[PDB]
Design a protein around this ligand. Structure first.
Ligand code: CA
Length: 89
């Protein structure tokens, strides 16, 4: 986990948290338990306009998955976006 990311995500707006919880549910719409595997995550990438390799997907998911279960949950997912905020020169 990362307190630096949760600190910024926690100070977010109600609309933000609601958005992540929504977009996340739309992605897991195919799953049965409610998660996103690198296998499917790669397919959705097409929507964004990018088509990264399959093995590369799990790469970014490795540093994200704190439990290393092999998939991204609503928890690791939400923080995933927040991490994009700290991405500055
Ligand atoms: Ca996980």
């Amino acid at each position: 986990m990362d307190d630096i990311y949760k600190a910024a995500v926690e100070q977010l707006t109600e609309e933000q948290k609601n958005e992540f919880k929504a977009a996340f549910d739309i992605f897991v719409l195919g799953a049965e338990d409610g998660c996103i595997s690198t296998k499917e995550l790669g397919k959705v990438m097409r929507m964004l306009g990018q088509n990264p390799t399959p093995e590369e997907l799990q790469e970014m998911i490795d540093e994200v998955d704190e439990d290393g279960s092999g998939t991204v949950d609503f928890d690791e997912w939400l923080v995933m976006m927040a991490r994009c905020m700290k991405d500055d020169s």
